[PDB]
Design a binder for this molecule. Structure first.
Ligand SMILES: *[C@@H]1O[C@H](CO)[C@@H](O[C@@H]2O[C@H](CO)[C@@H](O[C@@H]3O[C@H](CO)[C@@H](O[C@@H]4O[C@H](CO)[C@@H](O)[C@H](O)[C@H]4NC(C)=O)[C@H](O)[C@@H]3O)[C@H](O)[C@H]2NC(C)=O)[C@H](O)[C@H]1NC(C)=O
Ligand SMILES: *[C@@H]1O[C@H](CO)[C@@H](O[C@@H]2O[C@H](CO)[C@@H](O[C@@H]3O[C@H](CO)[C@@H](O)[C@H](O)[C@@H]3O)[C@H](O)[C@H]2NC(C)=O)[C@H](O)[C@H]1NC(C)=O
Ligand SMILES: *[C@@H]1O[C@H](CO)[C@@H](O[C@@H]2O[C@H](CO)[C@@H](O[C@@H]3O[C@H](CO)[C@@H](O)[C@H](O)[C@@H]3O)[C@H](O)[C@H]2NC(C)=O)[C@H](O)[C@H]1NC(C)=O
Ligand SMILES: *[C@@H]1O[C@H](CO)[C@@H](O[C@@H]2O[C@H](CO)[C@@H](O)[C@H](O)[C@H]2NC(C)=O)[C@H](O)[C@H]1NC(C)=O
Ligand SMILES: *[C@@H]1O[C@H](CO)[C@@H](O)[C@H](O)[C@H]1NC(C)=O
Ligand SMILES: *[C@@H]1O[C@H](CO)[C@@H](O)[C@H](O)[C@H]1NC(C)=O
Ligand SMILES: *[C@@H]1O[C@H](CO)[C@@H](O)[C@H](O)[C@H]1NC(C)=O
Ligand SMILES: *[C@@H]1O[C@H](CO)[C@@H](O)[C@H](O)[C@H]1NC(C)=O
Ligand SMILES: *[C@@H]1O[C@H](CO)[C@@H](O)[C@H](O)[C@H]1NC(C)=O
Lengths: 170, 316, 316
């Protein structure tokens, strides 16, 4: 089956950011022989790399790619936001041992100070600058409603909450 | 020739710190010689301190002098703006200073004001102010849209922009408000949108809901002080009222006094009751020599039946 | 006589953004007139740019002169220590300034409170407080120390390291200051150093300079309100005192009332000379009958000679 990989791997972007979805596959032969299923309709992009330059609100939704007679890929959920702070993650569903990532992205990559990551109402971590948290191994207790609060231009704000679930991989 | 006005700061200890006594030295030079009044400002407030106004030194056909302000570390590190203003020949030249960060604006803020009860009930033309502060001058000039909660149209709102002393802009939008529409409970909304921003600033105002209590007014005079004897300070306690929207006036000879005379504080929550405000006015000897009563008047929504309760006092 | 030398820098406005030509003026005054060698040092290294414009000015038996260094904009943020080196009679004197480091290094803010007139004039056990709160929790401890201006030894402080709900760290240090030394104006300094703080935090407090003025306490009761049997509140206007530091208490039958009973407003500046405080206390019916000379006391540093001004409140 084909798979969709994002560059950058954040499935939540801003209104006006850039992300390229790549239809990564095995024994793909010619790269210009695939089609891009949007939410519902067909996109007209080619070369197995659909870029969303200056992304609007309508670019969010279901994304999948199809290569010849094998069916479409498992659809990734893009969600274009527009806020002062956005909590970006590598994946909402993360297996055991998979590397979990969280980043408190400011609006139009503004520098954010005093960023506090909260996991279900308690302070997971705090730093004076904009910082990521990169969990090398993921645990089932390392899940919940993650959200970050920071300071953009010396004013306190609040990111949209993110439901991250880590499940037991067989 | 117009004067040239600069400000020199104090030392900075060499290593990394601020000295505990910070000297702000306003140099004025290259003016036509005469009388110059130095006024020092702290965010638009004139203070009365022992500023060291040096003598005027004449250099050729020009002249120069200086003034000095002293500060502690706390007031300088409180991130305030201090302005040396020369009141020379009926003209004002301004130069300001401030503790300077590297690059960090304070970010656009929006504040919505409920109408004063004096505007609501006495003048019967209430207005609502959306104040946009800490606006950088990097274009924008924020779009200011007015609406209600029920979608009804609003009156035409006037707008103004003032270039403040501390580098920023302050954009005021004043909207006249229907009185019957306001007292019935219509929620007004001010939307401040900037192009270089995410989701815009929405501010919502309404008539404050809850229990209502009539404001209890008491007024007191001064029982004399040794020395002084030329001025008296009257107080007015208005207490036990809900909600907190109260206008305090200080009438005399059935004539409204200017608001610069009184010093009415903000409402604060009492112990198991409503709010209290305190008013203080200074009369000269020429005002209470006519024996007429200084009448402290509270305008409030629950001050039945005239939306006004007043207490008149005079000095002895 | 040794010369008294000071160093001034050009103030930064528009607030935030530095001026392009930062000028340093090292004013040397109060010396016996003669020959003085003036040079400038960049961490002990001599440049090629200086101004030798300012001549001597013989004010009586002493004299005064200065020198100006003009800089480019980017040289000031290079964090290079500058020193105006003055040689006179074979003697070497130096003052240094660099770019003023931030009051909050990378976000870590420290507030050093001054002792109130309470604990300064009643129990004579005043506690200065260094509250530094923005710190991230790490394995390294918060190296907090205390100093004075005259180098006298300080007492043992109490540290209160605690992690807050929002992941920050609260460091509170309370030190018992000497009353006599605080009346001297001995500048107490709190110095905070952390493993992940690039430069030291220095906060300094002194006895508040300026004029001195005794408080002018007046304390009134209120007329009896219809429908009110238990409230019977009392007001106290305390006015015209220098400086802002004042503590207000209430005394029932020579016993101090709790501070939660009275609502003391902040000292706001009056028009004429000083500040006014509007403390209000409500008394229930049982102690309304047991009135026994209600007292509004306002302890203040300039209330000569008893450092305390109190009046009497009577219902009748
Ligand atoms: C495939 O499905 C996806 C969803 O599964 C479709 O995406 C949807 O597209 C519409 C049209 O762009 C979006 O409508 C916007 O709705 C948001 C509210 O959700 C509005 O933004 C809001 O703006 C205010 C302004 O002050 C701001 O305060 C809010 O914070 C902001 N909302 C957010 C969440 O930040 C905006 O004005 C539009 O009305 C849908 O939201 C969007 N769905 C999702 C889940 O995002 C997609 O269109 C569809 N594919 C096709 C081809 O139709
Ligand atoms: C630069 O200077 C301007 C004024 O010269 C500052 O604007 C002031 O901002 C404060 C809040 O930051 C405003 O206070 C607010 O007042 C409303 C009622 O008007 C009240 O409801 C709020 O709770 C708050 O107290 C203040 O009104 C405003 N002044 C003016 C004249 O508009 C600005 O903050 C300064 N910026 C910096 C970085 O110093
Ligand atoms: C995380 O939460 C804590 C609450 O415990 C915040 O600490 C509080 O910070 C404010 C200022 O940011 C302090 O207010 C200060 O009080 C002193 C008292 O004299 C006053 O002089 C200052 O002008 C200022 O108003 C407050 O005291 C402090 N709370 C405690 C308990 O120490 C902290 O700021 C929060 N951090 C973030 C990043 O949100
Ligand atoms: C948070 O993670 C992002 C993405 O992993 C980091 O952004 C990358 O930073 C490296 C090094 O500076 C660059 O080479 C990449 O081009 C960046 N990628 C993107 C998409 O921006 C970011 O630096 C991390 N932040 C922190 C504080 O570690
Ligand atoms: C997205 O790519 C375009 C194309 O170069 C660029 O102009 C734009 O600035 C990019 N936007 C972001 C947010 O990187
Ligand atoms: C998708 O491909 C699988 C091959 O594993 C096939 O079994 C399935 O029927 C396909 N789904 C379709 C054709 O809808
Ligand atoms: C989780 O830890 C194991 C340790 O053996 C490591 O091999 C694995 O790569 C880690 N998972 C990551 C980095 O996603
Ligand atoms: C996260 O999951 C919980 C569990 O039902 C749900 O109540 C909550 O609304 C979810 N939050 C988001 C942001 O999806
Ligand atoms: C840390 O505190 C100790 C205790 O007095 C002191 O001797 C030492 O110099 C301090 N170190 C730093 C780097 O502040």
């Amino acid at each position: 089956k084909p798979k969709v990989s994002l560059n950058p791997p954040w499935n939540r972007i801003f209104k006006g950011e850039n992300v390229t979805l790549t239809c990564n596959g095995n024994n793909f032969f010619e790269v210009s022989s695939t089609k891009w299923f949007h939410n519902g309709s067909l996109s007209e992009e080619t070369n197995s790399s659909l870029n969303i330059v200056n992304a609007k609100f309508e670019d969010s939704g279901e994304y999948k790619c199809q290569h010849q007679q094998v069916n479409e890929s498992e659809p990734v959920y893009l969600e274009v936001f527009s806020d002062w702070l956005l909590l970006q993650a590598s994946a909402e569903v993360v297996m055991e041992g998979q590397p979990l990532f969280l980043r408190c992205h400011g609006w139009r990559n503004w520098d954010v100070y005093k960023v506090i990551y909260y996991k279900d109402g308690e302070a997971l971590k705090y730093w004076y600058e904009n910082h990521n948290i990169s969990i090398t191994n993921a645990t089932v207790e390392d899940s919940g409603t993650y959200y970050c609060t920071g300071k953009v231009w010396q004013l306190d704000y609040e990111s949209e909450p993110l439901n991250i679930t880590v499940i037991k991989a067989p | 020739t117009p004067p040239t006005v600069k400000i020199l700061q104090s030392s900075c200890d060499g290593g990394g710190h601020f000295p505990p006594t910070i000297q702000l030295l306003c140099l004025v030079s290259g003016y036509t010689p005469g009388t110059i009044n130095i006024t020092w400002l702290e965010d638009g407030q004139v203070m009365d301190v022992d500023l060291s106004t040096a003598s005027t030194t004449q250099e050729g056909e020009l002249a120069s002098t200086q003034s000095e302000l002293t500060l502690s570390q706390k007031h300088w590190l409180s991130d305030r703006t201090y302005t040396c203003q020369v009141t020379y020949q009926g003209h004002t030249f301004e130069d300001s200073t401030k503790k300077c960060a590297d690059s960090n604006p304070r970010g656009v803020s929006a504040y919505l004001s409920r109408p004063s009860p004096f505007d609501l009930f006495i003048r019967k033309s209430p207005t609502i102010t959306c104040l946009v502060v800490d606006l950088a001058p990097s274009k924008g000039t924020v779009n200011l849209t007015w609406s209600r909660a029920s979608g009804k149209p609003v009156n035409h709102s006037t707008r103004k922009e003032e270039k403040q002393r501390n580098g920023t802009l302050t954009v005021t939008s004043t909207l006249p408000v229907g009185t019957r529409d306001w007292i019935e409970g219509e929620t007004y909304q001010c939307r401040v949108t900037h192009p270089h921003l995410p989701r815009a600033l929405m501010r919502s105002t309404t008539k404050t809901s809850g229990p209502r209590a009539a404001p209890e007014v008491y007024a007191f005079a001064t029982p004399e002080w040794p020395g002084s004897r030329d001025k008296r300070t009257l107080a007015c306690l208005i207490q036990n009222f809900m909600p907190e929207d109260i206008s305090v006036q200080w009438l005399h000879n059935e004539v409204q006094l200017p608001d610069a005379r009184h010093s009415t504080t903000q409402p604060r929550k009492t112990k198991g009751s409503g709010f209290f405000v305190f008013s203080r006015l200074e009369v000269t000897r020429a005002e209470w020599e006519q024996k007429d009563e200084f009448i402290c008047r509270a305008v409030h929504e629950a001050a039945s039946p005239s939306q006004t309760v007043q207490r008149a006092v005079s000095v002895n």
